[PDB]
Assembly symmetry: C3
Homo-oligomer: 264 residues x 3
Amino acid sequence: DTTVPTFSLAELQQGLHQDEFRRCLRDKGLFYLTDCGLTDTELKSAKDLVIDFFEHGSEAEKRAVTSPVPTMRRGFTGSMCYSMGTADNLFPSGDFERIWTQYFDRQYTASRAVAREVLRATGTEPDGGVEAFLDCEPLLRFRYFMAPHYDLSMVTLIQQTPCAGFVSLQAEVGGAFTDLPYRPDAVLVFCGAIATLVTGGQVKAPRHHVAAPRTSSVFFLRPNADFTFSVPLARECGFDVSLDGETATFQDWIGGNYVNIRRT
Amino acid sequence: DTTVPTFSLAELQQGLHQDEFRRCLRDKGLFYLTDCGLTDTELKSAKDLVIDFFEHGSEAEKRAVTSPVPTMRRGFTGSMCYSMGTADNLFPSGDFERIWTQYFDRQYTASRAVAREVLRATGTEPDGGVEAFLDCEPLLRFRYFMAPHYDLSMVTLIQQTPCAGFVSLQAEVGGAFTDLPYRPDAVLVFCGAIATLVTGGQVKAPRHHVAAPRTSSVFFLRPNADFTFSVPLARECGFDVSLDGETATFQDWIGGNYVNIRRT
Amino acid sequence: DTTVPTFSLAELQQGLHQDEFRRCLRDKGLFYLTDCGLTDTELKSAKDLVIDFFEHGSEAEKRAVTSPVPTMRRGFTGSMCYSMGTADNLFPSGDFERIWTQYFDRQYTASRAVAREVLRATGTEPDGGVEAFLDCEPLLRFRYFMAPHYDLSMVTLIQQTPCAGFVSLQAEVGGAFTDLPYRPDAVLVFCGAIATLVTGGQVKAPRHHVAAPRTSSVFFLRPNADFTFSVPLARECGFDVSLDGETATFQDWIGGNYVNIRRT
Ligand SMILES: [Fe+3]
Ligand SMILES: [Fe+3]
Ligand SMILES: [Fe+3]
């Protein structure tokens, strides 16, 4: 069955559907998530004020919220992007800041909450504990409009708005690329390679791609640099590590700059 | 003379053709290798049972031998790939496992044997000794069917089967790309950048590419993470290292994940 | 005003135009530089003897000045390249060596001199001091004839010769790509990400690209591996570092091999 499933976060938190969820994580590594605090209403408000900015902000206003290095980490990047994390943000105005701080907080809360359920369903206690693992280094990227890749996050949450009905996002499921359209009521979750790693290979990190024939909100839940894991265990589930020794950190593995995606 | 030469491994091991071999290594960095234990017969048997799998394995059978992260390190990857190393392998069946373990062992033995001859012909004693250097981290990748690159291996061994007579693989030789067709009786060896490094610049790592108008078996002989070398010597033969200090490891140089190829 | 400005190095060294220069560095991160010791006359002499080599050097002569790994770090690379740094160079002849050593020295002197002025205008004292910072690991690449990128240098100096009048190089300025043609009398300076980093975000690293419808001399002023910086400060100006701890080195950040450019 190559259906992309949907889970209620609330139901998962109540201990329901645990075998289904575990099988989804192992066999597919993607699902829609409902009842997680992330509404089309709220997306709508953040989306409107950032589109207003992209459409109608002077370039002086844009330059004030442009980083001096064009990394798409914070602020505006000209298809146009707006990026945020938990600090060091660049905001065009008081109203924008209120709306986007709130939006970011809800995405971060939902992402930590579903990651907690991924860890619980797989029996996983990260080295250093669950809450230090989840208090991490997220990145939110909003785009206004691929070669297939997998994400290097723990999980990635994706909200979309639809086209005037072309479906750009596709993921591999049961060995075929499958449409992943917008859902009013739901966020799309992709498991990333860090889920695979931390859980000892119990979670798939699916390949996906964004096709050209919209907007996308992508939240990457990314571990801290000092996230530590077992090297021989990494080797058991397909990681081609060049790491001496029995344990390593995320920094050891990926290097000194975050890397969000990888191709085969 | 831009011919790609052929050497008998047995003859090399008997101390013959040493000046020719050394000049080949320095000026070309590629050659066919005969008398190394690698036969079209044996390729044929491994090739048949993996093609049978690619052709006729259910997707359930394929999923069982698919890694949760799509790294093409172990198991099946869908042009289709099957990958192996010395441990943590994923095998579709008892018969497959017997055949491919044997095939892998012969490739690993041939690769270590020609690397030993590369080191001997160049007077090279790796830090830590020859046998610890060669007891390493190989990767075998079988493909069923480029931008030019060089390999980052010590050596790479390549077996091919021919097309129904187009020649896909080409390498730079004397400043032109030259066809490298299948040879019944021989394996194709490319020297990689680690040969250049370990030998102090006595071995070329040739650029090559796979052209679109078949199958390929590619064995990468890759050093351990703790392989140690001299930084100033690396600088003398063209390595643009950013390494503080007088010595470094392969992990220091390449990072926490193996990197098998590099472009200019 | 999206003009690419021009500064006299001599005037900058006399303390003139400091507010203009600072605003250029912050808002644009590129400028032409006159009065820096870099003449079309001198370019002409180095260019003629390397073109003579590219045109009329036998392949045996080319192989003698070809590195065994094709990294484009030193010597000849076949559009054709010739590369140099402060040592370990490969020169085709006595006359070539005299001319190119001199040319390299003038480029290195000009690059250090404008970097010194970037640091002074921004109030910047690198950890370890200015002169240890500038006594670094430059790379000169001459090409005989893109996806947009930024440079990871401190500064990059670019001399060009014109086409028979197409303008290949373009950079983002005030949110549009702008032609950067040859100037007889001037060198083009791009600030790189290390300028952004060392100065605490006071310098832009502009995106740029080389368009297909000539020659280019590109000098990268690149820090030493042990160049040390503040991690939280790196985070403040857009660097998406995965670095544990309060300070880090360039090697920590970029890895064991120099990386000269980066895309978004
Ligand atoms: Fe993705
Ligand atoms: Fe290759
Ligand atoms: Fe550049």
